[PDB]
């Protein structure tokens, strides 16, 4: 609507539904809420329960494997998982960490043309969480123009390997 | 508060008539616009006579 005057705002607190005329972070928030809520339940079990030991170990190793957790630890670190932890594991930002790209928009752009592969397979979805194990095996796809430039700068271009 | 004011200028004498005014609160931020704004000033003050030199 139109900007409200002083007296109008007192009468109408908010009209935000009709107030018309950059990323949702909605699904990550739901997953972050499910993890934290699950941590509350397991914390409420008796401290010497064998089920508590097994469930907490199974949960916390899963988070560590996907990279949402920095280091091996207890349920204390489990309360720090947020949308930022999920965003850090996306494929474009891993390229930005690995210095394969210097800007996020450049890192995103590399993905859809298919210059980036995770092992044998080529991944074109920017929304893709890479595991710690799979992070070791991300590289330029062969016969890509970017890989030519890297080899040319290093003076290591070999045309027998195409 | 209807009264007449005599104003002397280099060009001549001016006689003006005042219709109404808020006397007690005249020097207050909202009421003072009665004389500051030309549109509001015309509503309460009229020129009844003028004699140039």
């Amino acid at each position: 609507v139109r900007k409200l005057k002083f007296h109008e705002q007192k009468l109408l607190k908010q009209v935000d539904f009709l107030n018309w005329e950059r990323e949702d972070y909605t699904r990550y928030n739901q997953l972050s809420r499910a993890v934290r809520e699950l941590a509350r339940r397991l914390r409420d079990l008796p401290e010497r329960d064998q089920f508590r030991v097994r469930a907490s170990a199974a949960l916390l190793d899963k988070l560590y494997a996907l990279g949402l957790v920095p280091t091996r630890g207890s349920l204390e670190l489990c309360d720090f998982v947020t949308a930022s932890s999920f965003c850090r594991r996306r494929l474009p930002t891993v390229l930005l960490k690995l210095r394969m790209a210097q800007h996020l928009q450049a890192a995103v752009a590399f993905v859809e043309q298919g210059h980036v592969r995770v092992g044998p397979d080529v991944v074109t979805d920017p929304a893709f969480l890479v595991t710690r194990s799979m992070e070791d095996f991300v590289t330029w796809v062969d016969s890509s123009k970017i890989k030519r430039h890297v080899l040319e700068y290093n003076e290591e271009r070999d045309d027998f390997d195409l | 508060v209807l009264l007449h004011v005599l104003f002397e200028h280099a060009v001549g004498y001016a006689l003006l008539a005042l219709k109404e005014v808020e006397e007690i609160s005249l020097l207050q931020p909202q009421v003072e616009e009665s004389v500051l704004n030309l549109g509001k000033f015309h509503s309460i003050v009229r020129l009844v006579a003028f004699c140039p030199f």
Binding site: - | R46, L47, V48, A49, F50, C51, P52
Partner: protein, 566 residues
């Protein structure tokens, strides 16, 4: 916004529905009035206001008032004036009051308000309008008179007109126009009282109340003309001969040493039969020299000479010797000025009298040797007399004229030398003239030199003179237009020469002369030797060289030429 506009339309409804009830207007006509009134209402209720919309609103109601009036006569319906006419009239007055407040300085708007109030409004309403206008426009004497005129002639109240005049003189103590109209109105008041007695104080009836005005006004304004003016209004009324007699006697007694008073006495004496017309004139003259002995000033003399010419131009021999003596008499007194010397001499020439004009001419040259205008006046006389002294005239004239710039004398000498002197002497006169006159006055001299060459000689003589003068830069377009015409009259008509003359003229005046460019373009089309395909480049050259309004004038002239209107 429109809520004020919607406010005013509903007020118009009750009188409109009454017009439907009488049958004066049809229901469709009622709709048309509402629609048009709404459009005019929108213009005057805006935040941005113009004077024209208020006039349009007022003019519409006046036209509506007339249309109602004409229809009421055909039906013979005279009722309900208050519900219909007074409603419209009151609404118009509100518009004028709003407009007059917005534009106080506009007198035309004020007078339009006054004019409407006379026709349609109550006299008490018109009283307020005059007082409101006079409050801010008291510095205009004419507005005071208009209010006083309405009170006297229309409202028939002499008392109210008197206070209006008396107050006006306090604002304008020195105005002669206010005194004269005040003088007239009191004399007009005396006439009204005289008629009043016939139907059924005495000092008022005698015009003494107007006599007080005359005595005081003369003291404030010490002028002969104002005194003479007051006597004129006094004469216009049949009664009060004593008042006319009193003012007339005071005119001679109080105002002396002024020529105007003496002239007035003389013209009054103007106001078998040819003899009877005669001895009045000497009696009028008898006054004039009587003024001369008393007042010997130069100004009084000319009033006597100018009287003499008027009788002569209006028996003709009889009027003449009066002019002869007074012209001579002034001449030894040397009081007569140069302007009246010419006026007599020209007047004598028109009536075929050729011996006196020489005496006037000689007297002017002796008195004013430097004045070249008198020398031209003498020059015209001797040609009329056909005396063989024209050659002697020029030798005397030029030696007396030390200034080199005497343009009419040089032209006259060239004209005379053509008629009664050899061809070589005419060329000698022309060459001397071009040496003496160097500036813009040489423009006319060069044109007459070229015209003489074609007539005295032939085309060859004109070509020789044109070649010599083609580099003396002060020119006119007539110099080149004449040479173009001479080339056209010859049988050869060399097209190269025609273009050569046009290029020289366009070099001098091409920046400003739209006609010269159009003439050049028409030459290439209409001439048998012309090349019409050059017209494209002439137009392109004309547009670039012409500047400002001249360029746009050429476009219009050429567009007119493309059609047959030319």
């Amino acid at each position: 916004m429109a809520e004020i506009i919607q406010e005013r339309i509903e007020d118009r409804l009750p009188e409109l529905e009454q017009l439907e009830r009488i049958g004066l207007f049809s229901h469709a006509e009622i709709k048309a009035i509402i629609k048009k009134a709404s459009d005019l209402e929108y213009k005057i209720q805006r935040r941005t206001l113009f004077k024209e919309d208020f006039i349009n609103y007022v003019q519409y109601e006046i036209n509506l008032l007339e249309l109602i009036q004409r229809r009421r006569t055909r039906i013979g319906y005279s009722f309900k004036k208050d519900e219909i006419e007074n409603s419209i009239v009151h609404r118009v007055q509100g518009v004028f009051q709003r407009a007059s407040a917005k534009w106080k300085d506009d007198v035309q708007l004020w007078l339009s308000y006054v004019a409407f109030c006379k026709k349609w409004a109550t006299k008490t309403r018109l009283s307020k309008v005059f007082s409101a206008m006079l409050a801010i426009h008291s510095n205009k004497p004419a507005l005071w008179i208009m209010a006083a005129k309405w009170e006297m002639e229309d409202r028939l109240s002499s008392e109210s007109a008197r206070q209006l005049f008396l107050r006006a003189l306090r604002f304008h103590p020195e105005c002669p126009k206010l005194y004269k109209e005040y003088f007239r109105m009191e004399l007009m008041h005396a006439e009204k009282l005289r008629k009043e007695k016939e139907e059924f104080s005495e000092e008022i009836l005698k015009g003494e109340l107007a006599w007080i005005i005359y005595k005081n006004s003369v003291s404030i304004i010490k002028g002969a003309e104002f005194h003479v003016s007051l006597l004129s209004i006094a004469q216009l009324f049949d009664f009060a001969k004593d008042l006319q007699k009193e003012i007339y006697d005071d005119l001679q007694a109080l105002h002396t040493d002024d020529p105007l008073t003496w002239d007035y006495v003389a013209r009054r004496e103007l106001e078998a039969k040819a003899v009877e017309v005669g001895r009045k004139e000497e009696r009028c003259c008898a006054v004039y020299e009587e003024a001369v002995k008393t007042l010997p000033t130069e100004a009084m003399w000319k009033c006597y000479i100018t009287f003499c010419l008027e009788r002569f131009t209006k028996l003709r021999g009889k009027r003449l010797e009066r002019t002869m003596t007074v012209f001579r008499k002034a001449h030894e007194l040397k009081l007569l000025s140069e302007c009246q010397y010419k006026q007599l001499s020209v007047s004598l020439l028109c009536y075929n009298f050729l011996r006196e004009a020489l005496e006037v001419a000689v007297a002017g040259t002796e008195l004013f040797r430097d004045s070249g205008t008198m020398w031209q006046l003498k020059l015209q006389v001797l040609i009329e007399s056909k005396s063989p002294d024209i050659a002697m005239l020029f030798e005397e004239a030029f030696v007396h004229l030390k200034p080199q710039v005497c343009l009419p004398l040089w032209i006259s000498w060239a004209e005379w030398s053509e008629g009664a002197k050899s061809q070589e002497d005419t060329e000698a006169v022309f060459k001397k003239a071009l040496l003496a006159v160097i500036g813009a006055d040489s423009v006319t001299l060069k044109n007459k030199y070229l015209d003489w060459a074609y007539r005295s000689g032939g085309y060859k003589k004109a070509r020789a003179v044109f070649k010599s003068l083609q580099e003396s830069r002060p020119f006119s377009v007539d110099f080149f237009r004449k040479m173009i015409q001479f080339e056209k009259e010859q049988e050869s008509c060399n097209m190269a020469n025609i273009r050569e003359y046009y290029e020289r003229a366009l070099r001098e005046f091409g920046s400003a002369d739209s006609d010269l460019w159009m003439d050049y373009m028409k030459e290439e089309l209409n001439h048998p030797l012309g090349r019409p395909e050059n017209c494209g480049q002439i137009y392109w050259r004309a547009m670039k060289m012409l500047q400002g309004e001249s360029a746009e004038a050429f476009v219009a002239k050429h567009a007119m030429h493309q059609t047959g209107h030319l």
